[PDB]
Amino acid sequence: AVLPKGVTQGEFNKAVQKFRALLGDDNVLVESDQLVPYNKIMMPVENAAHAPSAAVTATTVEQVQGVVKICNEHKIPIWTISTGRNFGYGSAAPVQRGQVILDLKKMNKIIKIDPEMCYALVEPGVTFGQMYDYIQENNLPVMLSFSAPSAIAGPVGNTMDRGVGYTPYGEHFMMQCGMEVVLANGDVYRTGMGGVPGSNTWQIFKWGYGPTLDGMFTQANYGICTKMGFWLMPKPPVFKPFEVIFEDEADIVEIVDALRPLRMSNTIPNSVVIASTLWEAGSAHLTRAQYTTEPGHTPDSVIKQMQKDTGMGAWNLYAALYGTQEQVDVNWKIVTDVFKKLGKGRIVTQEEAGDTQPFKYRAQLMSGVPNLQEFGLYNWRGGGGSMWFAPVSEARGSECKKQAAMAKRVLHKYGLDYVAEFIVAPRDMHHVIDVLYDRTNPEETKRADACFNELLDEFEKEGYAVYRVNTRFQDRVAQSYGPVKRKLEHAIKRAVDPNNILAPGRSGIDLNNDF
Amino acid sequence: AVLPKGVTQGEFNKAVQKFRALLGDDNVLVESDQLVPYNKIMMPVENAAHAPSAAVTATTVEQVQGVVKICNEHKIPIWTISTGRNFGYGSAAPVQRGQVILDLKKMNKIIKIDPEMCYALVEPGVTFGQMYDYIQENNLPVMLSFSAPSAIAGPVGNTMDRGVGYTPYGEHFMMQCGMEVVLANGDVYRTGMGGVPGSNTWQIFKWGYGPTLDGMFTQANYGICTKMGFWLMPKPPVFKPFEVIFEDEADIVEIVDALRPLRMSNTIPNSVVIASTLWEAGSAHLTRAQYTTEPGHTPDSVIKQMQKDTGMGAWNLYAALYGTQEQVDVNWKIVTDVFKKLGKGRIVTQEEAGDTQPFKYRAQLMSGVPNLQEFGLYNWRGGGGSMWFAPVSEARGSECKKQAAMAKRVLHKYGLDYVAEFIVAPRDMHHVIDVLYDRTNPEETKRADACFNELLDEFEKEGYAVYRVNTRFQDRVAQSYGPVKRKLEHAIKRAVDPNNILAPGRSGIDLNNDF
Ligand SMILES: *Cc1cc2c(cc1C)nc1c(=O)[nH]c(=O)nc-1n2C[C@H](O)[C@H](O)[C@H](O)COP(=O)(O)OP(=O)(O)OC[C@H]1O[C@@H](n2cnc3c(N)ncnc32)[C@H](O)[C@@H]1O
Ligand SMILES: *Cc1cc2c(cc1C)nc1c(=O)[nH]c(=O)nc-1n2C[C@H](O)[C@H](O)[C@H](O)COP(=O)(O)OP(=O)(O)OC[C@H]1O[C@@H](n2cnc3c(N)ncnc32)[C@H](O)[C@@H]1O
Ligand SMILES: [Cl-]
Ligand SMILES: [Cl-]
């Protein structure tokens, strides 16, 4: 029987009794079969290491308040998820074995979509697909920022982990406005303008008055988000997605330095992607086995062959323009002039690309259309092993080259591939590297775990750290940011959750730690 | 003798002794004459209510750490200021009588200005004028976002109160990236990527990993900011400031609704201002006495006469376009088409305006050029009385009309004027109302205090609250946001400052409160 850390069967039984009284039997899952989908992980460790003791599906804020009351009474640690599609970051399983999962997928109402003020207010279980269908069927003049690869993922869960999309509203937390959280003591706290009785500005002005705390709850375990608002981009008259293909790995310095001023001036306004050959290949549903079944990493010689056969470059840049046709036309001239002056980069238009992949799904991503194309990355090697290694980088060419070379060296050392893309903000990149391996192979699984550890170590040696990470490594990554930060995080933790019931271990915040 | 609340002369003497040993006599100010500039306030209350017991000028982080050590030892409350130009919000004086002012103006180094990545990292005492002169003299391709009305105000102090400017980087806290604070226990905490040893991304990526806390320190008393970074806008090839004048007060509904889509699409990208007749007049250095010396508010009939004589409208909209000439030209056509279709609004160009005010200083504000023109508002009525009443509003015409009418009614009831402007974000307005009165007149000063209280009450009745407020009213405004918020703020306060030494009373956060 899986029980929470240091908690007795008797105390667990008492909590389950109370959870059933509060939520109804059908909302309290304690049977193995019922927990199966919750235990699925892609991390290089056996399922048992992240096995939940139970899952409870709350539907209302009052039920969430009831859940934390019970958790405090019997010291039950809960791992909160919204839509639970955190693949490559731990999926729906808890950070520590034995936690009860507080699954908020049933708390799924779209409270409001304002097409004039361009914002949405939603519950945790609201999915990207749900919002898209409502907006499209009702012809609302707004568009979404969508995070791959699941249409049943959603804005709340993604924003609580500070995920990203591919439109000009791609930095999801930047566009968040207003948040409601249930604190460990049961209090319902609304950030920003939400605490003002009769307010109509909760989704209008981010900060409110006094300390602005939305960020304190993201990537943290200081509260349970039950509602969140965010800004929506108004539907533009014209959308012009495009691609620029580069043939050589060494081109990354020039690509990034030519692109940066275009992003800094907002001439290209969306979160552009510069995808490596293998990310491009996997997103197009190509597999390593189609090219080689030899052990180890995929050789450069094979990759160049792949580039030859497919037209895919060493780097594949996907960007878009938005606005009136006249605005798009003027910005298109500026963009094409930059690449012409550079003397590198082949431009591919939406017309030329047609229904071919990856362009088709990239155009969908850049216009906020939910789609499942990127599940193809899971088939590059297959076997269910995938961890995102996502270091932050300056959007400076030399830095991107350095990080790409570092990651490639370490991955190859362990027989794995550099499958990556730079998601481009004006000043930063999320350098997203998909560490893919066959999790059904014990020898390879051990190499993947060792490889991920070495990637973290080698990047720290160069002053780099990741922006987000899977549950197996959340404590390790917390170390990257130093002891003073962890001490402050634990002081806040004690203040808002003295019984340590909210997801202890999240981002390395756990009162059992000596901080 | 002014002493901190409930603190003895003996304990205060011990702290002063230690402050002198740590900082040197010249950095410890306890004499009346030395405290004079610190005590100047524009709030409707006698100077004594905000009189500091002393001021200490620290220069280094180690000295700030030493100051908090001493404060904890002798329970000395400190009020931290950076450049201290918070006119209309309390100036440099403490929130509670008797606090020691920790004046960081000597901590004034520009640590870095990166013209490629477009960011700055500065100390608290760095001023807007200091940065402007460095950027201009060194021909750096970046521009500032400047908050009126002082060239010796600065980005750190302004951002710690979440102030605003008038370029596309006008929402100052939105562009902040990286912060260093000294906590009450002396620890030096760096947000975002700052805690990673050898990081080069502190001013590149805002969030870091785990809870992102920059916002928690703004408008709060949880730490002392000693360094702050922020993003800078790259200098555009072309800047095209312009104005649109509207003749009738009732036009505000249509002005705001026509402007909103232009802001939402980023076609007009800066924080536009829609200034009322009297704000326009005062900024042009006109005074009430030039038009009437009768008691009470300035009558509509006098204002219409003012409009006739000057060409100033009921609402005066100042905006700007930025980009290449071709981008500016296309956006100018879109903007002019909107106002032509509306059938209201007279466009005034930079060429037509020439060196005339207010256009001249507005063009400076919209291009980040420090200037002192708006000190003219202090001369509309003179006498040194000024408090900013700054309610948040949706950028929806009907809401703006409602708030303008509400404020005008309340101000007139108390014999004062509606002097205001809407600072326009895509979805929100900071509706900034300058409550001006003769502070040398006791009867009028009492009316101003009563008026400010009634403005707060009446706006709360309609679900509106302010984004920032003077020290005399910080506790009152905290009430606007509800008890759950205050309870959480006090729990965090206890956790990070158990001795209540950091500016108790700031934003209504004080451990002496029953929260
Ligand atoms: C596998 C994969 C993953 C992926 C991707 C492409 C592929 C092939 N592309 C991504 C992208 O474009 N952008 C991005 O940010 N992520 C991308 N991913 C990773 C992941 O699949 C998505 O991010 C997915 O959107 C995340 O799943 P979901 O949206 O369902 O979020 P969640 O699992 O519920 O929550 C994520 C974490 O947040 C914390 N949490 C969640 N809810 C709460 C509440 N209510 N309160 C407090 N904390 C909460 C948990 O830590 C949770 O694990
Ligand atoms: C009078 C007036 C005021 C004014 C204005 C026009 C006129 C005629 N126009 C403004 C504008 O365009 N935008 C805006 O945001 N404010 C405007 N004001 C008000 C004010 O003058 C300016 O905001 C000025 O920039 C503020 O002064 P300064 O920049 O010197 O900031 P400060 O006084 O040092 O600090 C402000 C408050 O922040 C907290 N504080 C400051 N430093 C710290 C540190 N290091 N750590 C923690 N907290 C800090 C204090 O609460 C302080 O009082
Ligand atoms: Cl996973
Ligand atoms: Cl003042």
DSSP string, B203-220: TT-S--SS---HHHHTTS
Distance CA A52, CA A197 (A): 39
Q: Are B225 and B180 in contact (CB under 8 A)?
A: yes
Of B187, B463, B466, the CB nearest to A200: B463
CA torsion, ordered A457, A463, A468, A470, to nearest 10 deg: 0
Q: In terms of Cα–Cα distance, which of A305, A254, A251 is closest to A278? A: A305
Q: Are A431 and A403 in contact (CB under 8 A)?
A: yes
The torsion region of residue A279 among left (phi > 0), alpha (psi -120 to 50) and beta comes to alpha
Distance CA B200, CA B359 (A): 41
Q: In terms of Cα–Cα distance, which of A136, A115, A131 is closest to B264? A: A115
Q: How far is CA A177 from CA A143, A503, A512, B302, in A?
A: 16, 24, 33, 42
Backbone dihedral angles phi then psi of residue B150, each to the nearest 5 degrees: -115, 130
Atom of ligand 2 nearest to the CA of B468: 15
Structure tokens at B511: 């451990």
Structure tokens at A46: 């056996």
Q: Is residue B91 lining ligand 2, measured as CB closer than 6 Å? A: no
A468: annotated active-site residue: yes
Please list the residue range(s) of chain B that carry CATH number 3.30.43.10: 1-108
Number of H helices, E strands in chain A: 16, 19
> CA Rg, chain B, in Å?
23
Q: In terms of Cα–Cα distance, which of A193, A198, A178, A206 is closest to B463? A: A198
Distance CA B507, CA B470 (A): 9
Structure tokens at B394: 């949706």
Report the side by side order of strands in the sheet with B224-231: B110-114, B119-122, B224-231, B176-182, B188-190
Does residue B141 have a cis bond before it (omega within 30 degrees)? no
Which residues, other chains included, contact A491 with Cβ-Cβ below 8 Å and sequence gap of 6+? B495, B496
Helix (H) or strand (E) run with residue B320 in it: strand B315-323
Q: How far is CA B484 from CA B278, B487, B508, in A?
A: 39, 5, 13
Distance CA B10, CA A394 (A): 53
Question: CB pairs below 8 Å between A and B: how many?
Answer: 288
Method by which the model was determined: X-ray
Q: In terms of Cα–Cα distance, which of B427, B400, B453 is closest to B171? A: B427
- B364 residue type, one letter: Q
User: Strand pairing of B100-103 and B78-81?
Assistant: parallel
Of B204, B207, B489, the CB nearest to A210: B489
Structure tokens at A377: 């990355």
CATH topology of domain A1-108: 3.30.43
Q: What is the resolution of the experimental data for this entry, in Å?
A: 1.3
Which residue carries 């009297």 as its tokens? Answer: B278
Which residues, other chains included, contact A490 with Cβ-Cβ below 8 Å and sequence gap of 6+? A509, A511, A513, A515
Distance CA B33, CA B510 (A): 30
The distance from CA A79 to its chain's CA centroid, rounded to whole angstroms, is 17
Helix (H) or strand (E) run with residue B168 in it: none
Q: Tell me the torsion sign for CA atoms B103, B108, B111, B117.
A: positive
Q: Is residue B170 lining ligand 2, measured as CB closer than 6 Å? A: no
Distance CA A484, CA A207 (A): 26
- B57 residue type, one letter: T
Beta-bridge partner residues of B424: B272, B429
Q: In terms of Cα–Cα distance, which of B33, B27, B98 is closest to B67? A: B27
CB atoms within 10 A of CB A342: 16
User: Strand pairing of B119-122 and B176-182?
Assistant: unpaired
Between CA A101 and CA A111, with CA A106 as vertex, the angle to 5 degrees is 130
Q: In terms of Cα–Cα distance, which of B232, B252, B295, B266 is closest to B399? A: B252
Do B205 and A492 count as a contact with CB atoms less than 8 A apart? no
Q: How far is CA B391 from CA A398, B282, B394, B428, B464, in A?
A: 46, 21, 10, 10, 6
Q: In terms of Cα–Cα distance, which of A108, A190, A188, A204 is closest to A156? A: A108
CB atoms within 10 A of CB A302: 15
Distance CA A374, CA B7 (A): 65
Q: Are B377 and B177 in contact (CB under 8 A)?
A: no
Q: How many residues does chain B have?
A: 515
Please list the residue range(s) of chain A that carry CATH number 1.10.45.10: 468-515
- A233 residue type, one letter: M
The distance from CA B228 to its chain's CA centroid, rounded to whole angstroms, is 17
Q: Tell me the torsion sign for CA atoms B431, A171, B481, B226.
A: negative
DSSP state of A380: S
> CA Rg, chain A, in Å?
23
Beta-bridge partner residues of B322: B239
Q: Is residue B104 lining ligand 2, measured as CB closer than 6 Å? A: yes
User: Strand pairing of A54-57 and A100-103?
Assistant: parallel
- A232 residue type, one letter: L
Which residue carries 């509904």 as its tokens? Answer: B253
Q: Are B26 and B73 in contact (CB under 8 A)?
A: no
User: Strand pairing of B100-103 and B54-57?
Assistant: parallel
Q: Are B400 and B256 in contact (CB under 8 A)?
A: yes
Distance CA B5, CA B18 (A): 19
A interface test, pick of B121, B162, B207, B475 with most A CB neighbours within 10 Å: B207
Which residues, other chains included, contact A301 with Cβ-Cβ below 8 Å and sequence gap of 6+? none
Of A264, A399, A463, the CB nearest to B197: A463
The torsion region of residue B416 among left (phi > 0), alpha (psi -120 to 50) and beta comes to beta
Of A173, A265, A494, the CB nearest to B495: A494
Do B465 and A199 count as a contact with CB atoms less than 8 A apart? yes
DSSP state of A366: H
Q: 3-state secondary structure string, A437-499?
A: EECCCHHHHHHHHHHHHHHHHHHHHCCCCECCCCHHHHHHHHHHCCHHHHHHHHHHHHHHCCC
Distance CA A178, CA A200 (A): 11
Backbone dihedral angles phi then psi of residue A54, each to the nearest 5 degrees: -175, 170
Distance CA A425, CA A394 (A): 9
Q: Are A146 and A200 in contact (CB under 8 A)?
A: no
The torsion region of residue A415 among left (phi > 0), alpha (psi -120 to 50) and beta comes to left
Distance CA A355, CA A180 (A): 41
Structure tokens at A335: 């963009």
Residue B173 CA to ligand 2 centre (angstroms): 13
Please list the residue range(s) of chain A that carry CATH number 3.30.465.10: 109-236
Which residue carries 């290089």 as its tokens? Answer: A44
Q: Are B152 and B176 in contact (CB under 8 A)?
A: no
The distance from CA B50 to its chain's CA centroid, rounded to whole angstroms, is 19
CATH code linked to domain A109-236: 3.30.465.10
Q: Are B76 and B30 in contact (CB under 8 A)?
A: no
The top-level CATH class assigned to B237-467 is alpha beta
What is the end-to-end Cα distance of chain A in Å, rounded? 31
Which residues, other chains included, contact B309 with Cβ-Cβ below 8 Å and sequence gap of 6+? none
CB atoms within 10 A of CB A487: 16
Do B209 and A264 count as a contact with CB atoms less than 8 A apart? no
Atom of ligand 1 nearest to the CA of A161: 38
A378: annotated active-site residue: yes
CB atoms within 10 A of CB A491: 18
Q: Is A482 exposed, middle or buried (0-12, 13-18, 19+ CB in 10 A)?
A: middle
Q: 3-state secondary structure string, A397-442?
A: HHHHHHHHHHHHHHHHHCCCCCCEEEEECCCEEEEEEEEEEECCCH
Q: Are B144 and B397 in contact (CB under 8 A)?
A: no
Distance CA B465, CA B470 (A): 14
What is the end-to-end Cα distance of chain B in Å, rounded? 31
The torsion region of residue A323 among left (phi > 0), alpha (psi -120 to 50) and beta comes to left
Which ranges of B121-177 would DSSP assign to H, the alpha helix? Answer: 128-137, 155-160
DSSP secondary structure, B70-106, as one string: HHHHHT--EEEESS---TTTTTTS-SSTTPEEEE-TT
Give buried/exposed letters for A443-473 (b at 16+ CB in 10 A, else e): ebbebbbebbeebbeebbeeebbbbbbbbbb
Question: From B485, which residue of chain A is nearest by alpha-carbon distance?
Answer: A189
Catalogue the E-assigned strands of A202-294.
224-231, 233-234, 238-246, 272-276
Which residues, other chains included, contact B89 with Cβ-Cβ below 8 Å and sequence gap of 6+? B161, B388, B468, B469, B470, B471
Q: How far is CA A200 from CA A48, A175, B395, B399, in A?
A: 47, 18, 11, 10
Q: What is the largest CA-CA distance in chain B?
A: 72
Please list the residue range(s) of chain A that carry CATH number 3.40.462.10: 237-467
The torsion region of residue A133 among left (phi > 0), alpha (psi -120 to 50) and beta comes to alpha
Q: Is residue B221 lining ligand 2, measured as CB closer than 6 Å? A: no
Exactly one of B430, B439, B472, B486 is catalytic; name it: B430
Q: Are B183 and B67 in contact (CB under 8 A)?
A: no
CATH topology of domain B468-515: Vanillyl-alcohol Oxidase; Chain A, domain 4 (1.10.45)
Q: 3-state secondary structure string, B406-459?
A: HHHHHHHHCCCCCCEEEEECCCEEEEEEEEEEECCCHHHHHHHHHHHHHHHHHH
Structure tokens at A184: 């460990």
Distance CA B208, CA A482 (A): 12
Which residues, other chains included, contact B147 with Cβ-Cβ below 8 Å and sequence gap of 6+? B128, B153, B158, B163, B164, B165, B172
Between CA A189 and CA A192, with CA A190 as vertex, the angle to 5 degrees is 135
Distance CA B152, CA B240 (A): 27
Distance CA B465, CA A199 (A): 8
Does residue B358 have a cis bond before it (omega within 30 degrees)? yes
User: Strand pairing of A54-57 and A78-81?
Assistant: unpaired
Q: In terms of Cα–Cα distance, which of A76, A215, A229, A211 is closest to B488? A: A211
Which residues, other chains included, contact A106 with Cβ-Cβ below 8 Å and sequence gap of 6+? A27, A57, A58, A59, A125
CA count, 13 A, side-chain hemisphere, B253: 5
B interface test, pick of A481, A487, A509 with most B CB neighbours within 10 Å: A481
Q: In terms of Cα–Cα distance, which of A249, A234, A239, A268 is closest to A425? A: A268
Distance CA B390, CA B429 (A): 9
Instruction: Sort out which chain A residues have CB atoms less than 8 A from B169's CB and list them.
Output: none
Q: Are B88 and B432 in contact (CB under 8 A)?
A: no
Between CA A426 and CA A430, with CA A428 as vertex, the angle to 5 degrees is 125
Question: From B213, which residue of chain A is nearest by alpha-carbon distance?
Answer: A216
Q: Are A436 and A385 in contact (CB under 8 A)?
A: yes
The distance from CA B101 to its chain's CA centroid, rounded to whole angstroms, is 19
Which residues, other chains included, contact B425 with Cβ-Cβ below 8 Å and sequence gap of 6+? A205, B171, B263, B271, B395
Which residues, other chains included, contact A454 with Cβ-Cβ below 8 Å and sequence gap of 6+? A410, A413, A414
Rounded to 10 deg, the angle between the B442-461 and B397-413 helix axes is 150
Pocket of ligand 1 (CB under 6 A): A 80-90, 104, 124, 147-150, 153-154, 156-158, 160-161, 163-164, 224-225, 374-375, 377, 506
Distance CA A484, CA A481 (A): 9
Distance CA A311, CA B240 (A): 44
B430: annotated active-site residue: yes
Q: Is B293 exposed, middle or buried (0-12, 13-18, 19+ CB in 10 A)?
A: exposed
